[PDB]
Write a protein that binds this ligand. Structure first.
Ligand SMILES: [Mg+2]
Ligand SMILES: [Zn+2]
Ligand SMILES: [Zn+2]
Ligand SMILES: [Zn+2]
Ligand SMILES: [Zn+2]
Ligand SMILES: [Zn+2]
Lengths: 526, 192, 40, 48, 98, 98, 34, 64, 257, 44, 87, 115, 240
């Protein structure tokens, strides 16, 4: 242990385990062992001293760093096997202080318990106040939350990219976000959320959004979609070339207008493109020249953002075209808090219809009260209260999970100091009538996220559309009109209903109707 | 339609105030939890001194576990009842639970007084380490804190170990949800 | 005592097999043993 | 069942195969109904 | 020349090694980008860490279904060579046989 | 081509032996958000085979404290199989025992 | 010695130094470099 | 990316206060004091400046 | 069965907000007055953008949306200006729109702040309110933003950019005499700035015969219109809407009979 | 048909037959210049 | 639509007789040429026999004079010089 | 894609009646005024003014759907008073009140500015 | 081989014959709408325009179908195709000349889906009869299906991203079948447990509890405002 802590003959990652009962000493040096740093405790005292803390405070312009701690032997790496034999102290101020002797042989002390969390779980404020599956759900949602995925997103040309116009760093933040760089690239906006049952359009995990706020850019985004097309001269006489074809030169073409394309067969930037529009005009020489041009998604309606032409790894000319489409929030768009509170925008009300406080503050978002009880996401309410206090005080709130310095009573007193109800409640006035609402609504700033799931990308319909070759059954063509699968469960449901005619309609007439001539004498047709 | 429009006048919200409890209620809950800790300690002392006589049809370990579990369950139930009685008529948690719209008495108790014992496969937190639930406890520690009794309410905040134990408990619920989603569909398809 | 119930028990019932997960009997006493613990 | 002082009427088993091989197909029908009702009603749910 | 090895970005052998944030900006690379991935055919590929049982360790398990009362397995692999791992079992047979 | 094919397709092994080659080792980096990218780069994958069948890894073992995030895990068939490193968790790179 | 009132600042200074040195993706980088 | 022109909640002009806010912070004003000096009384408006991240400054570091 | 006799007492009047009290009025009338402050007070805002060159880091319709929210002085011009839909011109003209031109080229090393000061209008009466100035976009060396816009008459009911109020604080019965809101613990709630209660008292005694009256307003102006002009225009517009409804009602009654 | 070099930002005319490459820079990534056709944006 | 509409009240399963197969097949003499097209056009007696059905979408088979959608396809036959087992 | 033009919330398309009156056969002396491209702004104010009329037995208004822009106002009066007369009289009262408010607000502005 | 073609979950034995993709079907996210009846489903204008129902031309509806044909596919509501007695299909957008668009008895106009059309509305997985119920279409101005809050329980549906399938029956016989067997009001009571399957839900349930509390008193204006929302009101204000 002395050698490892001095880094003389034993490297830091080497793990030494003494099974005293089994009279064994196992020393492990192979890769793949998961280990974490822990402060060393000797004689119920940390080896980490104020001198070390000051040298770290002056981390730069003095060359002092974490490696110096490791070399000094104040903090050492422990793997799971060695951690079996370690006597951890959760905190030095409490567990190894002279008190009721629960244990006086502590060997290490946790640097900070919150370091047990991951990247996505570290952005949850007050996660120790939420029911754990909601922490898991927020961990899942944070990966789908919009924001600025990378600073140099303009140069990049990804197949799909979502960029929020006005990302904001949370008013209530965890200290781990400083190292996640969530402040530099936020994913979400602070919204004045009021937990009320206003008109019933926020029921069942639904949300009512402020139409005026949406008009003011609230939760607006870009959707960049990149299409890559390569021209390949592979084949004896089968060559592909970028060019705007003609309705007569090619073997066959389409009613779609090709006027958008340029002389090189590529659509210029800044041109609005909707469905049934050609962005890349390609022609493949027939073994005339068949039209091999490419179209867009019918639902998609954006502007050609950037058109680049280059040679791929194969040396063939190819073009990447980035189309930009602006996504404003609308009914059906999904927003989620940082506590597993996921819901769709049920309806959008103007600032007039939205309820207002005595100060004229209307909630940007209204969520149903019933979302809170069953989920037991008390962290959401605490985040709302702390965000209110932070907005009034001008200081970003701290929501580090295991912090005894911050609690609901202290936050309530701080809020009381700013002329507000200590529990975050406000007297709200009905927007339609102006009458005071009998119950006092809980309203405050909460950090919400716009998930990538937009109703625009999910809406699709099929009505007498294209069919495939053999089955003669529906298949999506030039759109999202591939139809819906009438599965065995739906068949059984209609059987139970007894709607024989409707079941027959959905399974034959709608799928692949067909008639054949058959001989009565011998059943085989001819 | 009618009750939704009357709700525009009446109003409904939920908040921190509905989660707070009277200081007297907090004192009563803390006293109950402390008494439960002392009772579990007494049971552990009897087991250590071999003064615990196993009940018929159960081993010594099963008898000790049953006694500890009943003690902790009684503590949880009593604390929840105390919190529910402390709740006022204006309490929104009480309004929703009484109306049956959402939530339950157990949810109110967990939010206000005590989350309660955490169980994996129907048993207290197992000794994943060598005779330890976590490296922060002494070996052969059968106390409520060691074996995963969350004495703090969601409002108060769970301590660092209790959060991990609660995550362990909820992982079982997530697994059950996935299993049910992938399982319950085909029994009907077999019967049909 | 633990007895298989729920979805797996229903699965066994519809998937009748010579070996259930938790085969068991419910034996009832008809004499003085029923009301007498010792004779039971 | 053949054991003395054991109620030959109320005594039963949770094994449908045993019920079939001992008491018969009608006993299987009844016992299967009882077990299926037990599993359905264990959680307080009701089915016609 | 014997071939080409894909290079993990921001590693010691990547062109963006030791470059200051200003140099990365001049190269049109986000300084906040952590690297740690490969660009294969222009697609950023990340190698997911694969979790596996340890080697060279004796593990004594018990299988109720099997005919062995106990089994001590050991997956032996050469020290940083001969990647294929040879596993040996030393089992004690069940007493069920009468 | 061997390295490039393995990293691109994700089938970890020779393209001729894709039947026994591990799949899902290499994945396209998720760039929806910076947090998503970081989580993907710090992701772990549990195995599926004899070891997993004998002992279910779909559970939060006590040993995961400080090593694996207890909350982060996908919902559905992958619950408990895909994990994420704790913030300060470090994986030993290996060295000679000489 | 680090007093309780200063422990919160001290521990997070240590964590900040740790993340300044190691980064959040030095696992992958070290494995590939090795 | 850039300071919004209007407060999302109430619509108050907030796009002309970012440079002044930064100037006050340089002049050593606390964040709350700087917001008060700028005249942002409602916490809805204060949120705009307090939670804003000016990514445009770094976006300008890339050559056009 | 007849109209109320409302009275107005203006407590504060500045260049940014007007504070007043309306007495002897119905709660419905007061709520409609504020709802028209926010909704049906017309102003002039940019609603047509044509970008010739935009090399900035913000995309074209980003710049368009940002321009649309810039408040333009419309004190006396909104009344004379017509609605583009109503006006007979070919989609635009001086009688129903105001032309704006922006042309900023960053040739210096220092970052160029494209503010509302760079917006130039052919009508000297209609100009950005700030002319610190609202920042449209920051430009890097070699980047240019060239565009021409038309700003047309509109009101908040169509788009929030035509809403002239930065905030409409509306209140009544500050002491809760009518009990229109029930405090579970009245002592816990701060007093309203208009409260007329002693510090020891939390709620005014219940008034069974009381009716909502003496409504307090604080209308804060974004700058497009003076705060007093907002109130006057709102009252005139609501009266005009009612008069038009009466005309249509008279026609309908004549048709019925 | 004007293309902007991705490296030196130089405009150059290119036909459908000649290879896509900067006239002086030699850089092989080209970007089409913005269309002269004017697109109208509603400032909403 | 000259023929009436009928429903399948029964489905008899049986092995096709060689004589019935030969007579039913529209490929008189069987299939003996393994070439789809003799000189770039459909050839009688080949695999892509025009009798068996429609070849190109803008075409109609010579047997039932039906387009691709209307024509149900007609069977061919191959004469095996030696009898062959059925697996 | 389905988003309606904002102006559709306050502009009448060709052939649309601003206000229509339908007699209510359920109860005597009752009418339903369906007003298009109007909202609570007029609904609530007109309803409140009507309620001040002692000859108006019933006065109510409703928006059938927030996404639509119609208000249905139900007015039932006494046998000697017509619902149409009540509606007209209520409007003539609101207009007078607003004109008086405008005059008094102008006077207040002048007084405040002067001193 | 042929055996491979037949066998398999994707084969014709079980993949095609048992289940197949279907036409006149749509899918999108579902959102709450308390203003719709339990038997009504809100439908986006785009979905309604894309989907059509073939109406047989009759002297009763000749003029209305002629007007729909004149409107055409361009502007909703309109028509997409005209089928003559010959059975041939004519594309209206391709042919806008009214000379050949004259209708007569025996024709069929594939008019766009309109208000009141019967549609089968489903949420997967389909576990019981109530997972597939009939609804009357109501055209609404956004891109989500709407659902009354009571019908969420039978569907086990939530408004947090759930998507639901809409199917449009194409003939009068199937329309009658759905209208008489699969409608929501008929399925109020489930034979599974002889109890109602849908009831009052979160906001309505809590608010009705509060409303029915003893000490709830409503003034005259509030009472009239509430009575405005009674579809079945007889018009008589009860004695207070
Ligand atoms: Mg859902
Ligand atoms: Zn025949
Ligand atoms: Zn504001
Ligand atoms: Zn004009
Ligand atoms: Zn160049
Ligand atoms: Zn044929």
């Amino acid at each position: 242990r002395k050698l490892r802590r001095q880094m003389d003959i034993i490297v830091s990652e080497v793990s030494m385990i003494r099974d005293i009962r089994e009279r064994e000493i196992r020393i492990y040096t192979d890769a793949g062992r998961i280990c974490r740093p822990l402060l060393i405790v000797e004689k119920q005292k940390l080896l980490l001293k104020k001198r070390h803390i000051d040298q770290l405070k002056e981390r730069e312009y003095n060359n002092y760093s974490w490696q110096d701690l490791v070399a000094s032997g104040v903090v050492e790496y422990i793997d799971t096997l060695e951690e079996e034999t370690v006597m951890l102290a959760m905190t030095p101020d409490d567990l190894q202080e002279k008190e009721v002797a629960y244990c006086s042989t502590y060997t290490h002390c946790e640097i900070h318990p919150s370091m047990i969390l991951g990247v996505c779980a570290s952005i949850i404020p007050f996660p120790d106040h939420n029911q754990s599956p909601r922490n898991t759900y927020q961990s899942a949602m944070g990966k789908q939350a919009m924001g600025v995925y990378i600073t140099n997103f303009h140069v990049r040309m990804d197949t799909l990219a979502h960029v929020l116009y006005y990302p904001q760093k949370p008013l209530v933040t965890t200290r781990s976000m400083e190292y996640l760089r969530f402040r530099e690239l936020p994913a979400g906006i602070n919204s004045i959320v009021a937990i009320a049952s206003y008109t019933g359009y926020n029921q069942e995990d639904s949300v009512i959004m402020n139409r005026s706020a949406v008009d003011r850019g609230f939760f607006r985004s870009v959707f960049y979609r990149s299409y890559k097309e390569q021209e390949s001269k592979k084949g004896f006489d089968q060559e592909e070339v970028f060019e705007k074809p003609t309705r007569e030169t090619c073997q066959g073409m389409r009613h779609a207008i090709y006027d958008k394309l340029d002389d090189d067969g590529l659509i210029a930037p800044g041109v609005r493109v909707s469905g049934d529009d050609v962005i890349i005009g390609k022609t493949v020489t027939l073994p005339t020249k068949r039209d091999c041009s490419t179209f867009l998604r019918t639902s998609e309606t954006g502007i050609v953002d950037q058109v680049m032409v280059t040679l791929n790894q194969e040396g063939y000319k190819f073009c990447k075209i980035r189309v930009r489409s602006v996504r404003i929030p609308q009914i059906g768009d999904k927003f989620a808090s940082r506590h597993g509170q996921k819901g769709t925008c049920g309806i959008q009300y103007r600032q007039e219809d939205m309820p207002f406080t005595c100060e004229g503050i209307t909630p940007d978002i209204i969520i149903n009260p019933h979302a809170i009880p069953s989920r037991m996401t008390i962290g959401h309410l605490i985040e709302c209260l702390q965000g209110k206090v932070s907005a009034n005080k001008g200081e970003i709130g701290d929501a580090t999970p295991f912090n005894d310095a911050v609690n609901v009573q202290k936050i309530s007193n701080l809020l009381s100091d700013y002329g507000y109800h200590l529990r975050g409640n406000e007297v709200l006035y009905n927007g339609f009538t102006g009458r005071k609402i009998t119950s006092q609504i809980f309203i405050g700033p909460t950090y919400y996220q716009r998930l990538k799931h937009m109703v625009d990308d999910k809406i699709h319909s099929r009505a007498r559309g294209p069919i495939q070759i053999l089955n003669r059954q529906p298949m999506e063509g030039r759109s999202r009109d591939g139809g819906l699968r009438f599965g065995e469960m739906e068949r059984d449901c209609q059987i139970a209903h007894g709607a024989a005619q409707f079941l027959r309609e959905r399974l034959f007439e709608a799928s692949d109707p067909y008639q054949v001539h058959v001989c009565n004498l011998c059943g085989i047709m001819a | 339609t009618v009750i939704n429009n009357w709700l525009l006048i009446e109003g409904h919200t939920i908040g921190i105030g509905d989660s707070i409890a009277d200081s007297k209620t907090y004192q009563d809950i803390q006293n109950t939890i402390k008494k439960a800790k002392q009772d579990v300690i007494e049971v552990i002392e009897k087991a250590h001194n071999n003064e615990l006589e196993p009940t018929p049809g159960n081993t010594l370990r099963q008898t000790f576990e049953n006694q500890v579990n009943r003690i902790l369950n009684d503590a949880r139930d009593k604390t929840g009842s105390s919190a529910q009685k402390s709740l006022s008529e204006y309490n929104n948690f009480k309004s929703m639970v009484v109306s049956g719209a959402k939530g339950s008495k157990i949810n109110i108790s967990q939010v206000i007084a005590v989350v309660g014992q955490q169980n994996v496969e129907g048993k207290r937190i197992p000794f994943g380490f060598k005779h330890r639930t976590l490296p922060h406890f002494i070996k052969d520690d059968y106390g409520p804190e060691s074996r995963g009794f969350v004495e703090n309410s969601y409002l108060a905040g769970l301590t660092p170990t209790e959060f991990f134990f609660h995550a362990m408990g909820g992982r079982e619920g997530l697994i059950d949800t996935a299993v049910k989603t992938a399982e319950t569909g085909y029994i009907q398809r077999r019967l049909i | 005592k633990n007895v298989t119930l729920g979805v797996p028990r229903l699965k066994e019932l519809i998937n009748i097999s010579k070996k259930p997960k938790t085969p068991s009997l419910t034996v009832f006493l008809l004499g003085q043993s029923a009301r007498d613990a010792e004779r039971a | 069942l053949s054991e003395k002082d054991v109620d030959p009427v109320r005594t039963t088993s949770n094994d449908i195969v045993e019920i079939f091989t001992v008491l018969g197909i009608e006993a299987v029908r009844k016992a299967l109904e009882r077990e299926l009702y037990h599993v359905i009603s264990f959680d307080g749910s009701y089915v016609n | 020349f014997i071939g080409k090895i894909p290079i993990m970005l921001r590693s010691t052998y990547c062109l963006l090694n030791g470059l200051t944030d200003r140099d990365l900006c001049e190269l049109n690379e986000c300084p906040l980008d952590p690297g740690g991935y490969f660009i294969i055919n222009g697609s950023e590929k990340v190698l997911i860490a694969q979790e596996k049982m340890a080697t060279n360790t004796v593990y004594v398990f018990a299988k109720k279904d099997s005919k062995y009362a106990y089994t001590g397995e050991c997956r032996s692999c050469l020290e940083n060579s001969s990647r294929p791992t040879s596993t040996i079992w030393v089992s004690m047979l069940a007493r069920g046989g009468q | 081509d061997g390295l490039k094919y393995s990293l691109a397709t994700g089938n970890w092994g020779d393209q001729k032996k894709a039947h026994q080659a591990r799949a899902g080792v290499s994945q396209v980096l998720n760039r929806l958000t910076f947090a998503s990218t970081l989580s993907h780069l710090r992701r772990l994958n549990s195995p599926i085979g004899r070891d997993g069948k004998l002992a279910k890894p779909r559970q939060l073992h006590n040993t995961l404290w400080g090593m694996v995030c207890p909350a982060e895990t996908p919902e559905g068939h992958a619950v408990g199989l895909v994990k994420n490193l704790a913030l300060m968790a470090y994986i030993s790179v290996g060295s000679q025992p000489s | 010695e680090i007093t309780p009132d200063l422990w919160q600042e001290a521990c997070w200074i240590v964590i900040s130094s740790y993340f300044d040195e190691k980064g959040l993706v030095r696992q992958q980088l070290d494995s590939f470099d090795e | 990316m850039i300071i919004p022109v209007r407060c999302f909640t109430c619509g108050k002009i907030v796009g002309n206060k970012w440079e002044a806010y930064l100037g006050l912070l340089q002049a050593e004003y606390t964040e709350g004091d700087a917001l008060d000096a700028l005249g942002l009384k409602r916490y809805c408006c204060r949120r705009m400046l307090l939670a804003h991240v000016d990514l445009i400054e770094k976006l300008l570091n890339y050559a056009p | 069965p007849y109209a109320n006799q409302p009275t107005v007492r203006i407590t504060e009047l500045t260049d940014e907000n007007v504070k007043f009290i309306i007495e002897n009025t119905d709660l419905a009338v007061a709520n409609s007055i504020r709802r028209v402050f926010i909704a049906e007070v017309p102003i002039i805002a940019i609603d047509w953008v044509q970008i010739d060159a935009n090399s900035s880091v913000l995309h074209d319709e980003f710049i368009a949306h940002r321009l649309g929210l810039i408040p333009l002085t419309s004190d006396d011009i909104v009344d004379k200006l017509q609605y583009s839909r109503d006006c007979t011109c070919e989609e635009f003209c001086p009688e129903c729109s105001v032309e704006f031109t922006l042309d900023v080229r960053c040739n210096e090393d220092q970052t160029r702040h494209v503010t509302s000061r760079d917006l130039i209008s052919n009508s000297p009466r209609v100009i950005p309110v700030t002319s610190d100035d609202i920042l449209i976009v920051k430009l890097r060396k070699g980047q240019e933003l060239r565009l021409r816009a038309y700003a047309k008459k509109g009101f908040g009911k169509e788009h929030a950019k035509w809403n002239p109020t930065a905030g409409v604080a509306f209140e009544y019965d500050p002491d809760n005499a009518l009990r229109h809101t029930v405090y579970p613990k009245p002592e816990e709630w701060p007093k309203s700035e208009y409260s007329e209660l002693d510090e020891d008292e939390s709620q005014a005694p219940y008034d069974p015969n009381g009716k909502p009256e003496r409504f307090y307003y604080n209308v804060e102006s974004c700058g497009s219109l003076r705060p007093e002009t907002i109130v006057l225009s709102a009252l005139s517009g609501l009266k005009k809407k009612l008069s038009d409804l009466q005309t249509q009602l008279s026609h309908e009654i004549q048709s019925d009979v | 048909m004007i293309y902007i070099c991705g490296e030196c930002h130089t405009e150059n005319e290119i036909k459908s037959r000649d290879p896509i490459r900067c006239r002086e820079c030699g850089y092989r990534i080209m970007y089409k210049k913005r269309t002269k056709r004017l697109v109208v944006f509603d400032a909403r | 639509s000259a023929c009436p509409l009928r429903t399948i009240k029964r489905v008899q399963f049986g092995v096709l007789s060689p004589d019935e197969l030969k007579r039913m097949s529209v490929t008189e003499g069987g299939i003996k040429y393994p070439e789809t097209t003799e000189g770039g056009r459909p050839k009688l007696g080949g695999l892509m026999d025009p009798r068996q059905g429609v070849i190109e979408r803008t075409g109609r088979c010579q047997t039932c004079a039906g387009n691709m959608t209307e024509c149900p396809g007609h069977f061919g036959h191959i004469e095996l010089a030696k009898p062959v087992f059925h697996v | 894609m389905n988003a309606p033009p904002a102006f559709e919330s306050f502009l009448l398309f060709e052939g649309e009646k601003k206000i229509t009156i339908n007699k209510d056969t359920k109860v005597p002396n009752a009418c339903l005024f369906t007003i298009n491209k109007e909202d609570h702004t007029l609904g609530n104010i007109i309803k409140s003014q009507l309620l001040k009329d002692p000859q108006v037995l019933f006065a109510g208004y409703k928006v059938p759907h927030p996404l639509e822009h119609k208000i249905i106002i139900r007015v039932q009066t006494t046998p000697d008073y017509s619902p149409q007369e009540a509606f007209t009289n209520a409007i003539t009262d609101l207009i007078s009140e607003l004109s008086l408010l405008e005059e008094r607000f102008r006077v207040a502005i002048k007084d405040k500015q002067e001193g | 081989s042929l055996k491979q073609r037949l066998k398999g979950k994707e084969g014709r034995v079980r993949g095609n014959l048992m289940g197949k993709r279907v036409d006149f079907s749509a899918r999108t996210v579902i959102t709450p709408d308390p203003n719709l009846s339990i038997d009504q489903v809100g439908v986006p204008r785009s979905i309604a325009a894309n989907m059509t129902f073939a109406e047989i031309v009759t002297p009763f509806n000749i003029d209305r179908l002629q007007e729909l044909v004149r409107r055409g596919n361009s502007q909703y509501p309109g028509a997409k195709y005209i089928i003559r007695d010959n059975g041939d299909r004519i594309d209206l957008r391709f042919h806008p000349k009214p000379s050949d668009l004259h209708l007569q008895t025996g024709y069929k106009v594939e008019r766009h889906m309109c208000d009141g059309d019967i549609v089968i509305f489903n949420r997967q997985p389909t576990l019981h009869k109530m997972s597939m119920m009939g609804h009357r279409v109501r055209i609404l101005p956004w891109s989500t299906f709407r659902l009354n809050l009571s019908v969420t329980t039978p569907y086990n549906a939530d408004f947090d991203g759930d998507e639901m399938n809409l199917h449009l029956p194409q003939s009068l016989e199937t329309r009658a079948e759905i209208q008489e067997l699969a409608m929501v009001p008929r399925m109020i009571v489930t034979p599974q447990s002889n109890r109602p399957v849908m009831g009052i839900v979160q906001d309505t349930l809590t608010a009705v509890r509060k409303f029915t509390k003893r000490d709830v008193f409503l003034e005259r204006g509030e009472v009239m405002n509430l009575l405005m929302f009674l579809s079945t009101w007889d018009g008589k204000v009860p004695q207070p």
